[PDB]
Design an enzyme around this catalytic site. Structure first.
Site, PDB file in Angstrom:
ATOM      1  N   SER B 200      35.081  70.468   9.557  1.00 39.79           N
ATOM      2  CA  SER B 200      35.365  71.447  10.622  1.00 39.79           C
ATOM      3  C   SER B 200      34.692  71.579  12.011  1.00 39.79           C
ATOM      4  CB  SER B 200      35.350  72.938  10.127  1.00 39.79           C
ATOM      5  OG  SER B 200      36.253  73.561  10.527  1.00 39.79           O
ATOM      6  N   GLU B 324      45.450  72.933   5.345  1.00 40.14           N
ATOM      7  CA  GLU B 324      44.479  73.194   6.423  1.00 40.14           C
ATOM      8  C   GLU B 324      44.405  74.781   6.631  1.00 40.14           C
ATOM      9  OE1 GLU B 324      41.835  71.918   7.698  1.00 40.14           O
ATOM     10  OE2 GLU B 324      42.112  69.609   7.273  1.00 40.14           O
ATOM     11  N   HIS B 437      41.160  74.226   3.551  1.00 37.91           N
ATOM     12  CA  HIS B 437      40.101  73.885   4.380  1.00 37.91           C
ATOM     13  C   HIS B 437      38.694  73.851   3.958  1.00 37.91           C
ATOM     14  CE1 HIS B 437      38.648  73.251   8.409  1.00 37.91           C
ATOM     15  NE2 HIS B 437      37.749  74.194   8.587  1.00 37.91           N
TER      16      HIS B 437
HETATM   17  C1  LIG Z   1      31.721  86.600  13.988  1.00 38.35           C
HETATM   18  C2  LIG Z   1      33.107  85.897  13.535  1.00 38.35           C
HETATM   19  C3  LIG Z   1      33.221  86.085  12.120  1.00 38.35           C
HETATM   20  C4  LIG Z   1      34.206  85.538  11.656  1.00 38.35           C
HETATM   21  C5  LIG Z   1      35.089  84.696  12.264  1.00 38.35           C
HETATM   22  C6  LIG Z   1      36.209  83.797  11.317  1.00 38.35           C
HETATM   23  O1  LIG Z   1      37.106  83.403  12.136  1.00 38.35           O
HETATM   24  N1  LIG Z   1      36.380  84.259  10.145  1.00 38.35           N
HETATM   25  C7  LIG Z   1      37.241  83.507   9.402  1.00 38.35           C
HETATM   26  C8  LIG Z   1      36.971  82.401   8.429  1.00 38.35           C
HETATM   27  C9  LIG Z   1      36.879  81.098   9.065  1.00 38.35           C
HETATM   28  C10 LIG Z   1      36.612  80.174   7.832  1.00 38.35           C
HETATM   29  C11 LIG Z   1      34.946  79.640   7.602  1.00 38.35           C
HETATM   30  N2  LIG Z   1      34.990  78.443   6.868  1.00 38.35           N
HETATM   31  C12 LIG Z   1      34.845  78.779   5.599  1.00 38.35           C
HETATM   32  C13 LIG Z   1      34.753  77.687   4.593  1.00 38.35           C
HETATM   33  C14 LIG Z   1      34.183  76.458   5.109  1.00 38.35           C
HETATM   34  C15 LIG Z   1      34.505  76.189   6.546  1.00 38.35           C
HETATM   35  C16 LIG Z   1      34.611  77.230   7.140  1.00 38.35           C
HETATM   36  C17 LIG Z   1      34.554  77.111   8.879  1.00 38.35           C
HETATM   37  N3  LIG Z   1      35.063  75.818   9.231  1.00 38.35           N
HETATM   38  O2  LIG Z   1      34.874  75.574  10.399  1.00 38.35           O
HETATM   39  C18 LIG Z   1      34.974  84.666  13.614  1.00 38.35           C
HETATM   40  C19 LIG Z   1      33.709  85.162  14.270  1.00 38.35           C
HETATM   41  N4  LIG Z   1      33.662  84.696  15.693  1.00 38.35           N
HETATM   42  O3  LIG Z   1      33.726  83.715  15.993  1.00 38.35           O
HETATM   43  O4  LIG Z   1      33.409  85.781  16.591  1.00 38.35           O
END
Ligand SMILES: Cc1ccc(C(=O)NCCCCC[n+]2ccccc2/C=N/O)cc1[N+](=O)[O-]
Ligand SMILES: Cc1ccc(C(=O)NCCCCC[n+]2ccccc2/C=N/O)cc1[N+](=O)[O-]
Ligand SMILES: *[C@@H]1O[C@H](CO)[C@@H](O)[C@H](O)[C@H]1NC(C)=O
Ligand SMILES: *[C@@H]1O[C@H](CO)[C@@H](O)[C@H](O)[C@H]1NC(C)=O
Ligand SMILES: *[C@@H]1O[C@H](CO)[C@@H](O)[C@H](O)[C@H]1NC(C)=O
Ligand SMILES: *[C@@H]1O[C@H](CO)[C@@H](O)[C@H](O)[C@H]1NC(C)=O
Ligand SMILES: [Cl-]
Lengths: 537, 533
Positions: B200, B324, B437
């Site tokens: 990612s 994904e 993902h």
């Molecule tokens: C302040 C904040 C807080 C939450 C988000 C947001 O988009 N949350 C959704 C979950 C995304 C998945 C994360 N993840 C989970 C497991 C493995 C890899 C990954 C990431 N891979 O890249 C976004 C923000 N923000 O950017 O302001």
């Protein structure tokens, strides 16, 4: 009378007729050819609505086909059967409003379901007298009464200055209607059942059928309809009043004629050939599958666009059979897209594909064109000549027939009609077009009319059996509103096309196979997305 | 004292710790400082090299996690918690970790460097799924992972200012790369053979090191798992970064100097509290503070750079998981939840496309909807659900990956592409999410080899294959075993044949075209369309 065949003398509203006894492979049929159904639309009557034929004296000989309506004649491939078979086979004349009748011999004893054929030819060409429209086989083998009429084509049929009295437009469609009225009054004298009349037609003939469905004064003249490879909706079958006016005015200039009355009066002084010789010159862009003079949305015959009308009409009372051939587009490529020819494999380049899309989709903005190209490109082989060739054909095929048909079937089904749909996938062994063209536009017709039953035509035995199946489907549909044989169950069944299941059948040498979805994804592009794309650029 | 655990680096002496891997011991040196703590007035600033230290610095323990948002959507749930910080939060977090075999390798050994993901707003090198002992023990690898600043601390930017220039989280990574060059030879690692790999945002970071000249002399090969520097989420323009930084400042009560000064007086959590509130649209798979096109670390946009770059020197391994997009739907799109089958209606599908493609005009969103609808079953809840997922995964990962693979290959790079299709038997997310993902990682790092994690035998066998591909790639630039002479083999991705392989329990299968029709829509047509609207 006295010493002639008493089974060939008939009276109609206009007088007495003498027909002829023809041989079909399985026995004799009765033919009544070249029956006049209107006053000759000549002289001051050019561009005018037809008037009913005034009664004649004595016995009119009805043993030969009459004049073919004045029209453009194809010269792309001189002496080549593949084009010549569509060319006029009688004298060209503005005096051409005649119709033909085939019946069993002797004529039937009880009232017999009637089939009325309306030929295609892009509204600029055609004749009811062509060999592939021979009614003798259907009449003999199925007992049908078959009627085909000549209607005016080209300028004489469809040149319009909308709103004017001297060229109201659509008079070629009115020619067809008058023949339908003629059938209502007169077909009982042949043993035909006026209470069971089925229209069927191919291409522009099919669109014609669609327009009678959508025009209420025609609706009381038939009960069922078949549309082969053509629709009243779609990009070629109609033009706005404004564009019809523009085309008529341009053609006038091209032939010397500078107030609608004066303009039209000048046009009537022109020899018919001067009009034909300039007909193809009024199209707004370099195009294929576009025709200069076609039905116009006049607010009369057509009270609104076909699209508006099929979207908002009641059709519960209606039974329709619609379908397409496997390669609707291939034919058209050689009449305009650089790179294509009947005499080579027509493998083209990506560049030629891009240029071809602009010609086959003449109304597309640069964005819309790119959308077409990106959709039809194979991105694993974006430059393979064979793929680009067949994609060009599919672009022209889908945009012009398959998706307009898909939309028509879908709208009619959603609004109560009983719809049956097919794809015709068999290539005639006798076909003189190259293999790469597959099963081209118009080449199911000879099988529907049963020409393979004629031994001298060198079709295979399987093609003979095939033709018979098809003749049964069409005639069973004419009789009942249903192509399936009631006295039969073993043979696979032909389901109605619904919006929910989108079923249709393959027609080939194999037994019926039911398929779901009529180019569902691709036609979503054409029918749903493209219009919004064009509207935003 | 165990001499295998005593290492001298340019900054002083380290003591590491001996750890058990299922097949033997490994040496681990955890919590090694590579920068001056980026605290106080050094917030939002480029990192500085760690000062020397006296005595023996204890490196037997994971250091603190860079300060970040902690996920609370499903409290207590293994599927989300497994990504949450597993050590204390601190802005003082610039440390890295090294695993080597035990004893230390006698020959200089290929180095793998892991850059974690987490959307540039989260992540830590100390998560269990990033445990380097299995690769070190089984494949004899020297493995390195660093913490880098995330969120406002790593990527809040006021382009052109001296005190918040942007991209400092990426400079954190770069400094750790420099550290590895300067010191890894003391652990037995080979500085002349360094492979980056990441997932990612980590994959995207790796991508940006490929596109930033000063990074290029610090590594030789790259692996990008489920992420790219190109695409819709990994970067922002200077202007849009300035806008978000200014908005965040407004929101916490704050001339650039005076803006950033007031921000530096704010407790860490005050910034995190408003982090997710500066996005211009209701979005998913979109992050507030990410790398910025500064005209410095990134001299131009990633798409401009990959379009014009010369990558003849480069070997790259890139890929995606089967589903994904699924993970992200439950974080915004109405109708979606991990706790039911998430069967949605057509209305919800249109509504979710605006959220999945926040930048689409009405027309562009209609185009997406029309393209992803199955017109044989336009209203079937299951298709619509699976399509919503596909829109999000294709738009954000799969097609960006396909574009990168394509441009790199066309410009001299040696590229290998995969799609990962095995769903973990231990997975706690619902079945409809498929292979989400992030869930290839545990297999690459070799976790199934740990008996106590209750993976299946075939999954163990499969993890060993993946570790083999990755390490073989690190050694040679070619993931194929130079001794395994059985067909099939992993072929190079090219523009012509577009070959890639599937990774799953079955032997490698070679496929052609990475959602080629669909990615043509995203990569070629859609940009003409947003532009034309
Ligand atoms: C302040 C904040 C807080 C939450 C988000 C947001 O988009 N949350 C959704 C979950 C995304 C998945 C994360 N993840 C989970 C497991 C493995 C890899 C990954 C990431 N891979 O890249 C976004 C923000 N923000 O950017 O302001
Ligand atoms: C004045 C003129 C002359 C030629 C064209 C033109 O488009 N020619 C290309 C060939 C068309 C195919 C005709 N056809 C052949 C067999 C069976 C059916 C059909 C038609 N089905 O509808 C068009 C014009 N014009 O309208 O100006
Ligand atoms: C086929 O013939 C036409 C006309 O003769 C020509 O334009 C075209 O280039 C030819 N194509 C091939 C592949 O030979
Ligand atoms: C059928 O084949 C015979 C063989 O001699 C040939 O003479 C005749 O012209 C053919 N007919 C057609 C319509 O091709
Ligand atoms: C699934 O659960 C969420 C919250 O519990 C709810 O909003 C959603 O409507 C549910 N979906 C279905 C299809 O029942
Ligand atoms: C593995 O399964 C056993 C039950 O057989 C359980 O006690 C143990 O905690 C499990 N371990 C993990 C990591 O889930
Ligand atoms: Cl210290």
């Amino acid at each position: 009378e006295g010493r002639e065949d008493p089974q060939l003398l008939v009276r109609v509203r206009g007088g007495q007729l003498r027909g002829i006894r023809l041989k079909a492979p399985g026995g004799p049929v009765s033919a009544f050819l070249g029956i006049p159904f209107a006053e000759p639309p000549v002289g001051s009557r050019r561009f005018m609505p037809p008037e009913p034929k005034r009664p004649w004296s004595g016995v009119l000989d009805a043993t030969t086909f009459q004049n073919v309506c004045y029209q453009y004649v194809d010269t792309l491939y001189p002496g080549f059967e593949g084009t010549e078979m569509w060319n006029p086979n009688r004298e060209l004349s503005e005096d051409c409003l005649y119709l033909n009748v085939w019946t069993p011999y002797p004529r039937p004893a009880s009232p017999t379901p009637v089939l009325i054929w309306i030929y295609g030819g892009g509204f600029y060409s055609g004749a009811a007298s062509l060999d592939v429209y021979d009614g003798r086989f259907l009449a003999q083998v199925e007992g049908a009464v078959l009627v085909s009429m000549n209607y005016r084509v080209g300028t004489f049929g469809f040149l319009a200055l909308p709103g004017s009295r001297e060229a109201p437009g659509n008079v070629g469609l009115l020619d067809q209607r008058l023949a339908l009225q003629w059938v209502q009054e007169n077909i009982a004298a042949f043993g035909g059942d006026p209470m069971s009349v089925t229209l069927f037609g191919e291409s522009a003939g099919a669109a014609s059928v669609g327009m009678h469905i959508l025009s209420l004064p025609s609706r009381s003249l038939f009960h069922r309809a078949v549309l082969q490879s053509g629709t009243p909706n779609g990009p070629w079958a109609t033009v706005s009043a404004g564009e019809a006016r523009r085309r008529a005015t341009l053609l006038a200039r091209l032939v010397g004629c500078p107030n609608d009355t004066e303009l039209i009066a000048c046009l009537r002084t022109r020899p018919a050939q001067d009009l034909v010789d300039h007909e193809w010159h009024v199209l707004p862009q370099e195009s294929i599958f576009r025709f200069s003079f076609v039905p116009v949305v006049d607010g009369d015959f057509l009270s609104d666009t076909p699209e508006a009308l099929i979207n908002t009409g009641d059709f519960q009372d209606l039974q329709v059979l619609v379908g397409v051939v496997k390669d609707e587009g291939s034919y058209f490529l050689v009449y305009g897209v650089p790179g294509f020819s009947k005499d080579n494999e027509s493998l083209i380049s990506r560049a030629q594909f891009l240029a071809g899309v602009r010609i086959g989709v003449p109304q597309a903005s640069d964005l819309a064109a790119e959308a077409v190209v990106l959709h039809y490109t194979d991105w694993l082989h974006p430059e393979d000549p064979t793929h680009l060739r067949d994609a060009m054909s599919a672009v022209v095929g889908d945009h012009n027939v398959v998706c307009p048909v898909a939309q028509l079937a879908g709208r009619l089904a959603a609004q109560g009609a009983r719809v049956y749909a097919y794809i015709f996938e068999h290539r005639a062994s006798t076909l003189t077009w190259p293999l790469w063209m597959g099963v081209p536009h118009g080449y199911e017709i000879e099988f529907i009319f049963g020409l393979p039953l004629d031994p001298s035509l060198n079709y295979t035995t399987e093609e003979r059996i095939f033709a018979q199946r098809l003749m049964k489907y069409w005639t069973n549909f004419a009789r009942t509103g249903d192509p399936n044989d009631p006295r039969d169950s073993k043979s696979p069944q032909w389901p109605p096309y619904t919006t929910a299941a989108q079923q249709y059948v393959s027609l080939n040498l194999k037994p019926l196979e039911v398929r779901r979805g009529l180019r569902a994804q691709t036609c979503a592009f054409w029918n749903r997305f493209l219009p919004k794309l064009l509207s935003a650029t």
